[PDB]
Design a protein around this ligand. Structure first.
Ligand SMILES: O=C(COc1ccc(Cl)cc1)N[C@H]1CC[C@H](NC(=O)COc2ccc(Cl)cc2)CC1
Lengths: 318, 318
């Protein structure tokens, strides 16, 4: 009853104010648990009313934070699960609900295996004495690299992300496992690119065009890789896949307080200058060489088929 | 008298039949000595008659072997020296001859210094733990690399030249000095190019367009370097500079017996198949990053000015 309502609220405000939970895998787990509790703790008999209330609460979620697309695309995954179950039972009400629940359960148990799947897949993409470059921080990519390091020796060049220098803690984490790690400013990306073999980077969201929304500055790294023709690898699980297209959407970049870019102590100039701090940026699919997912490697030119396999095309608007 | 005639002949037939001397630096030395002996052992009073007989014998030389452009372009150098001396003394007959002789002497003493000059210049182009790739055999390039190796550690990938696998002896010579050397077939150029930092190659002739005539297969290596945007360096002394342009000329490629490509023992198919063995090939200037010479480094877009500095424009046809 009101527990469900206040938990939905709590989650909405946690998504709105700050980043909670930090890992987007934990965010997917939390939103899936909440969707399960909603579909269990409501008086819905027909699948249509359930889908409608799910779409409404998902609209509220998406309005809470548009840049966090995992919640929305997993809501769409739940909607596709409901559609599949209704087609199975109609192409049956209690069995409907329990079958939806076991579908969500299998989705959740395969959710925690994507990390291990990518880690296992990592070995056949790294050779000895290779030079990797990565930008920012990504749990999936550091797991990739520290799993490849157990049987291979290679160098990782971590380009810090300004202003949020998450790349520093990533470099430290990689050095923990003895992965020879060079830390540099993002300004030195093109200067060092000539000596890099591969580029491995995570992402926040993959669009239907194949493009991906990743931390700012990664588009420049992709342009450098394309200039030097080095393969650019994206190790992104299959819950960051978003059916929306690049310019049919709104609110792509996430702008945070310019205090991160230019501090308050600069004084009077802060009334004359316009400071901008875009967290995310757009990378076209032409600059991506290969996508690594929990199922296996795939070219950017197959992400649309993955969409068709994951999301109903009438649910791309929620 | 007849000594000069028979020596000129001997040289013509040596150039016509085979490669003598082997090193084109020694070829430049020999042709300069012969030009000196001609200008000394003829009864010429006016500079015009001397220039005319020089042009005639140079035409005979060029007809002996068109692919060997060092002889012709150094004949043009001697003609430019004669023009400069005549302009100095006219803008004076015995002094004319002795001044031409001392000009040839300074040209010759600076001729043997180009090797050492490039070797000295080599250090500021190689950094530690760098991956060089080269194709075929080139005395200048191996001197470059073994001089850089005295103070730096780096890897050299030598692509053998089919059919004349001169790259094997180059790899052996480089390994003599402890330069970690990988030997491969030319077929693996693009496969390995992704892990190469620089490409350093010699040449047989540099054209006025900036393009260069080098051993077959080097155009593919240059295309691979351009694809991967790796800098391509050409360590060529300033006596391989030819004022002729790419397609205003004749007889660019040198075709040798196809026995080198397909052996006689193949039998009847040798009457039905057409075999071709081009020794040289054309590399456009767009694929060269930097030229290294005895004077210093220069972009391909300055070779025309070097021409203006070396050859009179009315002597480009001999
Ligand atoms: O030591 C490093 C560290 O590299 C960087 C560290 C930091 C920065 Cl800022 C940039 C680069 N990288 C190695 C990577 C292998 C390479 N080459 C070799 O070991 C040999 O390479 C070959 C050998 C044979 C073939 Cl067929 C191809 C390449 C030496 C340098």
């Amino acid at each position: 009853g009101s527990e469900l309502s206040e938990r939905i609220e709590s989650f909405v405000e946690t998504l709105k104010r700050g980043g909670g939970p930090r890992s987007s895998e934990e965010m997917a787990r939390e939103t899936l648990g909440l969707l399960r509790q909603i579909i269990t703790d409501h008086r819905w008999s027909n699948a249509g009313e359930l889908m409608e209330l799910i779409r409404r609460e998902g609209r509220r979620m998406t309005a809470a934070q548009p840049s966090e697309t995992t919640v929305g695309n997993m809501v769409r995954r739940v909607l596709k699960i409901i559609r599949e179950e209704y087609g199975r039972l109609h192409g049956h009400y209690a069995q409907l609900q329990s079958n939806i629940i076991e579908a969500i359960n299998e989705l959740l148990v395969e959710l925690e295996g994507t990390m291990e799947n990518i880690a296992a897949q990592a070995l056949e993409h790294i050779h000895s004495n290779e030079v990797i470059m990565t930008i920012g921080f990504s749990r999936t990519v550091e797991a990739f690299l520290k799993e490849a390091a157990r049987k291979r020796k290679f160098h990782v060049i971590v380009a810090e992300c300004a202003p949020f220098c998450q790349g520093h803690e990533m470099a430290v984490n990689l050095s923990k496992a003895g992965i020879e790690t060079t830390v540099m400013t993002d300004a030195a990306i093109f200067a060092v690119m000539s000596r890099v073999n591969k580029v491995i980077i995570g992402t926040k969201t993959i669009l239907a065009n194949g493009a991906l929304r990743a931390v700012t500055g990664t588009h420049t790294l992709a342009l450098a890789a394309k200039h030097h023709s080095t393969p650019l690898i994206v190790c992104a699980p299959m819950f960051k896949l978003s059916p929306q297209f690049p310019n049919e959407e709104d609110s792509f970049h996430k702008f945070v307080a310019p205090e991160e870019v230019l501090p308050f102590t600069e004084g009077d100039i802060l009334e004359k200058v316009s400071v901008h701090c875009p967290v995310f940026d757009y990378v076209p699919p032409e600059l991506i060489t290969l996508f690594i997912s929990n199922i296996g490697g795939n070219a950017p030119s197959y992400i649309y088929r993955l969409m068709s396999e994951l999301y109903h095309p009438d649910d791309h608007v929620l």
